[PDB]
Amino acid sequence: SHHWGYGKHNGPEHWHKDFPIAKGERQSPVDIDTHTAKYDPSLKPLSVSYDQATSLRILNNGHSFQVTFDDSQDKAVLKGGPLDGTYRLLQFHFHWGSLDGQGSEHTVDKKKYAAELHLVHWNTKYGDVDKALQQPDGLAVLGIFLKVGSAKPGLQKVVDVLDSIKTEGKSADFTNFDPRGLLPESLDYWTYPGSLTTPPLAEGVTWIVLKEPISVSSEQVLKFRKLNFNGEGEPEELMVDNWRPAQPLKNRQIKASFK
Ligand SMILES: CCOC(=O)c1cnc2c(NC(=S)NCc3ccc(S(N)(=O)=O)cc3)cnn2c1C
Numbered sequence: 001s002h003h004w005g006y007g008k009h010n011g012p013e014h015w016h017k018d019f020p021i022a023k024g025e026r027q028s029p030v031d032i033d034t035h036t037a038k039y040d041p042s043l044k045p046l047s048v049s050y051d052q053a054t055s056l057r058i059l060n061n062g063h064s065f066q067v068t069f070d071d072s073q074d075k076a077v078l079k080g081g082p083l084d085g086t087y088r089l090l091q092f093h094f095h096w097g098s099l100d101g102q103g104s105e106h107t108v109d110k111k112k113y114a115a116e117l118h119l120v121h122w123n124t125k126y127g128d129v130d131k132a133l134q135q136p137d138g139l140a141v142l143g144i145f146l147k148v149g150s151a152k153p154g155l156q157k158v159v160d161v162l163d164s165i166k167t168e169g170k171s172a173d174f175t176n177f178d179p180r181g182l183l184p185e186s187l188d189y190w191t192y193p194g195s196l197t198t199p200p201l202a203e204g205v206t207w208i209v210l211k212e213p214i215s216v217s218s219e220q221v222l223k224f225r226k227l228n229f230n231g232e233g234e235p236e237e238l239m240v241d242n243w244r245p246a247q248p249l250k251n252r253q254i255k256a257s258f259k
């Protein structure tokens with residue numbers, strides 16, 4: 001267990017004491033005001049190249065569940081859009097709510113989605129993720145909203161393994177998972193400079209938030225809500241509402257890839 005969390009005594013309003021950058025100039029997430037975001041005709045097309053992805057493990061880390069990838073070579077990469085050079089996929093994880101009307105970190109005209117998927121990539125010009133974490137352009141997170149409706153077939157393999165990683169520190173083999181199955185049709189996006197949304201809240205992320213949500217079923221998101229923050233044997237505290245709220249935009253502009 002880590003000291004920080006999402007509760008009354010350790011949640012987002014407390015994080016600044018250990019992580020003073022929590023009150024910084026480029027924190028995430030933010031509200032995306034669709035009427036103030038501006039179309040940027042100079043944004044290059046986004047390239048999501050996930051066909052050679054090598055998934056390794058699925059892990060309950062006490063704040064989310066993550067799927068980890070082999071990032072030792074250019075396998076699954078993000079390029080183009082606002083990005084200079086090549087960003088390698090390291091992991092994905094989710095944020096979700098106790099109810100379908102909350103759970104996302106980003107908001108769209110103050111609308112909260114049921115959940116948000118973060119695909120976390122690092123800039124290969126810095127050689128490893130730890131070095132990338134120290135740079136203002138070290139990371140790129142592709143954010144995808146989840147709404148409750150039809151099931152997402154490409155998520156079901158994830159849902160079906162969550163019973164094996166109920167508590168903090170549990171992991172399982174999770175090879176041959178294809179993250180292409182988590183993507184919506186459209187790659188239309190908003191982009192802005194921001195931060196990690198969990199400690200250490202490092203201000204090194206280029207955010208790329210897709211406009212089109214994916215639909216997941218009520219049964220799929222209910223399985224997320226059966227996970228536990230606690231380790232095996234501690235009082236049961238459901239892993240729900242593991243989202244940081246919108247932070248001040250301050251001196252930033254959100255750009256749109258689309259009209
Ligand atoms: C040299 C190879 O390094 C590693 O093996 C390594 C290092 N770190 C990780 C992570 N965790 C990461 S990168 N955490 C930082 C973070 C990111 C993204 C957001 S968000 N919520 O999207 O803003 C928050 C926080 C997950 N595997 N892994 C691995 C496998």
Ligand SMILES: [Zn+2]
Pocket residue numbers: 093094095118197
């Ligand atoms: Zn995240």
